[PDB]
Amino acid sequence: ANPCCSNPCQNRGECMSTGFDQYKCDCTRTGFYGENCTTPEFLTRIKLLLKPTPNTVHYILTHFKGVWNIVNNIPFLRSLIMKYVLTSRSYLIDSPPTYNVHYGYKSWEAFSNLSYYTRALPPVADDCPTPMGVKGNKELPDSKEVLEKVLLRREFIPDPQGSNMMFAFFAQHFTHQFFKTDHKRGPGFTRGLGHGVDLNHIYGETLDRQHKLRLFKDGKLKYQVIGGEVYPPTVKDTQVEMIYPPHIPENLQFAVGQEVFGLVPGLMMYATIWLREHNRVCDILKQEHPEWGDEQLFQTSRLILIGETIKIVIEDYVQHLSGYHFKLKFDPELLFNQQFQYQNRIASEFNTLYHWHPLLPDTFNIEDQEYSFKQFLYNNSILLEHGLTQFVESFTRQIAGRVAGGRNVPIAVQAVAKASIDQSREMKYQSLNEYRKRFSLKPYTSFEELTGEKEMAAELKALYSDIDVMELYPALLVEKPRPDAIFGETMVELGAPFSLKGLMGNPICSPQYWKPSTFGGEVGFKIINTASIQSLICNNVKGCPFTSFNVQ
Amino acid sequence: ANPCCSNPCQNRGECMSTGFDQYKCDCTRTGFYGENCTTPEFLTRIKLLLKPTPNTVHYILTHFKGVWNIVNNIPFLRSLIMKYVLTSRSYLIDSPPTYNVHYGYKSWEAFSNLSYYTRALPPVADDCPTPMGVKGNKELPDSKEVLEKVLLRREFIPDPQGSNMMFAFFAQHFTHQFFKTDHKRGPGFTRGLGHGVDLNHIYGETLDRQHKLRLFKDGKLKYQVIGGEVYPPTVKDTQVEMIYPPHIPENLQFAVGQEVFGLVPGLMMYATIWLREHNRVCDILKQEHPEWGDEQLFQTSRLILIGETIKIVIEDYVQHLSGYHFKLKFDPELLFNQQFQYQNRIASEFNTLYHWHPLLPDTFNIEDQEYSFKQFLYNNSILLEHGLTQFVESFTRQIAGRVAGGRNVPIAVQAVAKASIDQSREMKYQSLNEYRKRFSLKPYTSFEELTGEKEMAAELKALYSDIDVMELYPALLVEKPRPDAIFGETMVELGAPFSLKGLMGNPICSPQYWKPSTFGGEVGFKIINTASIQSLICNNVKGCPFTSFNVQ
Numbered sequence A, B: 001a002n003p004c005c006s007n008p009c010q011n012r013g014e015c016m017s018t019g020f021d022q023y024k025c026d027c028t029r030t031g032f033y034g035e036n037c038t039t040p041e042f043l044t045r046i047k048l049l050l051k052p053t054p055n056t057v058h059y060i061l062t063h064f065k066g067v068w069n070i071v072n073n074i075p076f077l078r079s080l081i082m083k084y085v086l087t088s089r090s091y092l093i094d095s096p097p098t099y100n101v102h103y104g105y106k107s108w109e110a111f112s113n114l115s116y117y118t119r120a121l122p123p124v125a126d127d128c129p130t131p132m133g134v135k136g137n138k139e140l141p142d143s144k145e146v147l148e149k150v151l152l153r154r155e156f157i158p159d160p161q162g163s164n165m166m167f168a169f170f171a172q173h174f175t176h177q178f179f180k181t182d183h184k185r186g187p188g189f190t191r192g193l194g195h196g197v198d199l200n201h202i203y204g205e206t207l208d209r210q211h212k213l214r215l216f217k218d219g220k221l222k223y224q225v226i227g228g229e230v231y232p233p234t235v236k237d238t239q240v241e242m243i244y245p246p247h248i249p250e251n252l253q254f255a256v257g258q259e260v261f262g263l264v265p266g267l268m269m270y271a272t273i274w275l276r277e278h279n280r281v282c283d284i285l286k287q288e289h290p291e292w293g294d295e296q297l298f299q300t301s302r303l304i305l306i307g308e309t310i311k312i313v314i315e316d317y318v319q320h321l322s323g324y325h326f327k328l329k330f331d332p333e334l335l336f337n338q339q340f341q342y343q344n345r346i347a348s349e350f351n352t353l354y355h356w357h358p359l360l361p362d363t364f365n366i367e368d369q370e371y372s373f374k375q376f377l378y379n380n381s382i383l384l385e386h387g388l389t390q391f392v393e394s395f396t397r398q399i400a401g402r403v404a405g406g407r408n409v410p411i412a413v414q415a416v417a418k419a420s421i422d423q424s425r426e427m428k429y430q431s432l433n434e435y436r437k438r439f440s441l442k443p444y445t446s447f448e449e450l451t452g453e454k455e456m457a458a459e460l461k462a463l464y465s466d467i468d469v470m471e472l473y474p475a476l477l478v479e480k481p482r483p484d485a486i487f488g489e490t491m492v493e494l495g496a497p498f499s500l501k502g503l504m505g506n507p508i509c510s511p512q513y514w515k516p517s518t519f520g521g522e523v524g525f526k527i528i529n530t531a532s533i534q535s536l537i538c539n540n541v542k543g544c545p546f547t548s549f550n551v552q
């Protein structure tokens, strides 16, 4: 019945019903006017004609390597370009946040209730005739059918950008601090009330959990020593609740900030590294400040590790994923004379697009062994048997799977892929092409334009009939990749703005935080400003093994 | 022992210990350098030479009435000046917030824990030799002596700006949505987790309380009709928890958003008016949108009432308090091309300065009756006896007390004034002159300069010895007022930046919220942009009695 069901308002105009059979578009500050906000103002037509497409820009950033290495060696210029990268992404995210799974109009409940993931696009109204609004059939195609025909892996498809398992598990570990779906409430709800990079996955979401994980001496976290090596403490020692199957022995129930990180030894590898890093920064700070107590050493270390994480995520992780020859830079000062909101609300669509399970290999290869999924899950004895050094060496060599390009979801996690489809529908997501328009991308005009091939496209066409009815999540995994890239256009163009806010939106990047005294002085500040994935491993893993996010 | 105990860093430099008996000042972006950040950069010397004092600017704003009358009638000019008013206040508030009662250094706990009031100045460290740091005696003077000698009212001193009881109860009602101290935790903690103007004092702080207050028809709040007049519902009917003495009959236990508003009929008067306003706006919205459900009608009305509140607070309330001839303007668009953070954290010092109890008369005069405090408190039968119209007419006629200038705290609330003092100390507030420097005011050099007189000054000198040991709260109430004004310099220069962030920092003032469709279209938008204390009364009180925040 809802007259806004067909999504009539274009260019981020807002639709409002004005009766049972009429609507009105609010074109305020869109740059467009007219009934559906499709008539561009004069300056808008200029800006449209000038603005290059994301595929054009991507080409430039990934070619002319000779030029980029000149640019990278000129501080002033590199800073200027990075400033552009930061601000060109800015306009896409609503901050303060707006919609969520229950609210397709702005409300105080949607703004104030932090238990919701927010929504970049409002949900399709309950009384719309079709799942996408008015287009398509009364029901979407069978999710198991979509999954089997175009998502499940046949042969393992390796990532051509060379992403390795250090990368894959870093992605899983890093993102699971702000993707923490509260399944008791439903898929549109989160337990990550900090809505960003607060490192609750190391320190715990609550004060009570944090205090159970702390040593309360020298700012440090509790730990145990097994075979001369530092690991996290146990559940028995801390009374911290963790998720473990009943057959796991008490001595192998490791306690960390995030309750699910006992799921896979890969997560536990990173939890151990970051635990070691915290206590390392504690030693440095105590050295610098013998007059400091446990509480301040702890708090200042946590601020520094938040810094290191953002540093590493931008200059190593995102740097690898982007494929750019331009060297990204973590530098909060670049936004100080710009308009920017130092806040963030985690979007449901950010969670959804980040289900990068094709990354996972068919086996996990550590030293000379090849563990199946079944052997790998919930088995930290693997970590104890081989050690961190061997883990890093092995995972740095093992190639991860390609995410875009279709048919590369391992069958071991087919239930997760199927739920991504089912839960996206349950949360009433708009169509793929609605999300492309929301992020300034041209809508795809056929399934072949979407995939770049003919077989999966034909299968998708038999299932969905209309390209305007194609769904966001499956589309992301079948999209035509950029040339020799891990991702297609949609993943990058949706992911970048969400990411930007999560990283630069952190309070430590704001002017009142970004100064040496926040971090215990110039020594603490320098730990943030020199962090890299390589120094993280080198300082905290015996033998200082070489590491990287790509295979060699 | 802490080397930062003497507050050595000037001009908002941050102090950090570097050993047991050494410190370092972080002068980053202060405009100053050198050991205590007192050596001004070149651009700083210039801005210093140009920037006029607050007493000078205030003179200009409260004189040249003829000139202001020209300016007020030139839309472009009036807008431009309000823009400066808004932005000249910005640089004073930390946003994202920094300190709180437990953290004198920046930390994730202080940033993230919303149960704290934030702090404009860090607390004095526990191990400082004196309450103010290093100056003064081992203990501050007896709070009872300070209270009795310079705060307690002898004769009622009327406010020369003509503030009335409509103003006083509006102040109490409005501020008590974000000053809501959690006494179970301590004075530095709040129950107002929204930290601003969310109208939880009407709608309830929690969802469960909100649902108990709602009718779930037509977006409306529950109400009762007594003698043909609309009042809040009862505790018996709603199961909403309220604070009442045991002797209060069930028919008189009104249930409203804020649990303490049964305290005085003055608060209940405003609770009734806003209840009436919410349901009135529901009627208007239902007319515009017959297709809307209860939930959207409720949520949109709440957003509109948030809008009206901020409008009335700026253009009537702050307009009256300021004494300015320039006509202030509520217009979010004025900040859209400015750097500004749409967020707020309620400061402890803001709470402290807003204890405006000298406002209160010795008796409350309604029609021909005169109620004592004992007769007035927790007595809603007074509201029923006289009705809202008579309340408005009476409170519009009765003069309120002057707040600065000393000796005008009503004795009936002396226990509250003594607690303001004792709790400021318990929260380890820094000295008056420290807070003055923090807000770019010149420190006082004697008690006579503070008071502008000789008697109270001599009393204060015998108590405190050193002006640098004078405390913030008592100073506010004994301070020399502006000429025929209600407040002294310190009250205004501290209150304005806090107030600014609370009002303009609201999400509905952000670009993505500030458009007609947020408020149900142009009709809802207009309700916000035409609101006034007079229209609030006229739309909701029988007879449309004249009202004002000043006596006529």
Ligand code: COH
Binding pocket: A168, A169, A171, A172, A173, A175, A179, A180, A181, A260, A264, A266, A351, A354, A355, A356, A357, A359, A360, A377, A413, A416
């Ligand atoms: C960063 C990419 C990434 C990787 C490498 C990854 C690696 C793996 C992995 C191999 C070690 C296995 C067996 C799984 C299995 C799961 N993943 Co991921 N996942 C990943 C991205 C996600 C995201 C994003 C979610 C949603 C998390 C949420 O909402 O809480 C996720 C959720 C899941 C869930 C459901 C969450 C729940 O119900 O609590 C299962 C099961 N998984 N994942």
Ligand code: COH
Binding pocket: B168, B169, B171, B172, B175, B179, B180, B181, B183, B264, B266, B351, B354, B355, B356, B357, B359, B360, B413, B416
């Ligand atoms: C203009 C401001 C204003 C007015 C008119 C006002 C009018 C009155 C009034 C007149 C009938 C009476 C009997 C009181 C009595 C009190 N006020 Co005020 N108060 C006011 C500003 C405040 C502020 C600010 C606080 C602190 C509130 C908090 O933190 O909860 C306050 C707190 C109190 C408290 C302590 C609350 C507690 O301990 O939980 C009492 C008692 N009172 N107040």
Ligand SMILES: *[C@@H]1O[C@H](CO)[C@@H](O[C@@H]2O[C@H](CO)[C@@H](O)[C@H](O)[C@H]2NC(C)=O)[C@H](O)[C@H]1NC(C)=O
Binding pocket: A113, A114, A115, A116, A184, A185, A186, B206, B207, B208
């Ligand atoms: C945020 O929103 C959720 C969803 O409405 C609230 O959860 C509901 O809470 C009520 C009681 O307040 C329960 O009866 C419902 O069963 C809950 N629903 C779900 C889906 O969990 C939640 O309480 C809100 N949080 C806050 C702080 O207001």
Ligand SMILES: *[C@@H]1O[C@H](CO)[C@@H](O[C@@H]2O[C@H](CO)[C@@H](O)[C@H](O)[C@H]2NC(C)=O)[C@H](O)[C@H]1NC(C)=O
Binding pocket: A206, A207, A208, B113, B114, B115, B116, B184, B185, B186
């Ligand atoms: C915000 O800070 C307060 C003060 O530290 C926390 O309250 C304490 O919580 C501990 C552990 O839960 C209790 O044992 C104490 O009794 C509490 N103290 C006080 C003074 O209330 C509060 O839990 C924090 N909030 C969050 C979300 O972490």
Ligand SMILES: CCCCC/C=C\[C@H](C)/C=C\C/C=C\C/C=C\CCCC(=O)O
Binding pocket: A085, A086, A089, A175, A313, A314, A318, A321, A322, A328, A329, A491, A492, A493, A494, A495, A496, A497, A498, A499, A500, A502, A503, A504
């Ligand atoms: C300041 C630099 C950050 C801004 C990034 C903006 C643009 C970058 C360059 C370009 C491409 C990003 C690649 C993938 C998007 C998905 C997920 C991102 C993962 C990252 C995450 O999880 O946050």
Ligand SMILES: CCCCC/C=C\[C@H](C)/C=C\C/C=C\C/C=C\CCCC(=O)O
Binding pocket: B085, B086, B089, B175, B313, B314, B318, B321, B322, B328, B329, B491, B492, B493, B494, B495, B496, B497, B498, B499, B500, B502, B503, B504
């Ligand atoms: C956009 C306009 C708002 C900015 C105000 C900034 C400056 C105004 C003009 C000048 C003087 C304000 C007067 C008193 C300060 C105390 C309390 C204020 C009570 C108000 C409150 O409680 O918030």
Ligand SMILES: CCCCCCCCO[C@@H]1O[C@H](CO)[C@@H](O)[C@H](O)[C@H]1O
Binding pocket: A148, A149, A152, A153, A154, A455, A456, A459
């Ligand atoms: C792990 C694969 C499970 C497939 C079971 C369902 C069959 C539908 O998948 C079919 O299989 C082939 C895949 O190579 C493709 O050629 C067909 O296009 C596809 O329709």
Ligand SMILES: *[C@@H]1O[C@H](CO)[C@@H](O)[C@H](O)[C@H]1NC(C)=O
Binding pocket: A006, A007, A008, A009, A035, A036
């Ligand atoms: C856009 O406007 C045209 C006429 O201005 C109208 O026919 C059309 O239906 C509108 N769009 C949608 C999706 O309804």
Ligand SMILES: *[C@@H]1O[C@H](CO)[C@@H](O)[C@H](O)[C@H]1NC(C)=O
Binding pocket: A374, A375, A376, A379, A381, A382, A385
């Ligand atoms: C757990 O890992 C060990 C290697 O340390 C392996 O021998 C064992 O089979 C694994 N357990 C399961 C149930 O797969």
Ligand SMILES: *[C@@H]1O[C@H](CO)[C@@H](O)[C@H](O)[C@H]1NC(C)=O
Binding pocket: B006, B007, B008, B035, B036
């Ligand atoms: C300020 O610096 C001066 C020297 O510039 C020094 O003598 C003094 O001790 C410092 N201030 C304080 C409060 O110590």
Ligand SMILES: *[C@@H]1O[C@H](CO)[C@@H](O)[C@H](O)[C@H]1NC(C)=O
Binding pocket: B374, B375, B376, B379, B381, B382, B385
């Ligand atoms: C309450 O107010 C009424 C006036 O309506 C008055 O008669 C009564 O005495 C008051 N009660 C108390 C306890 O003061």
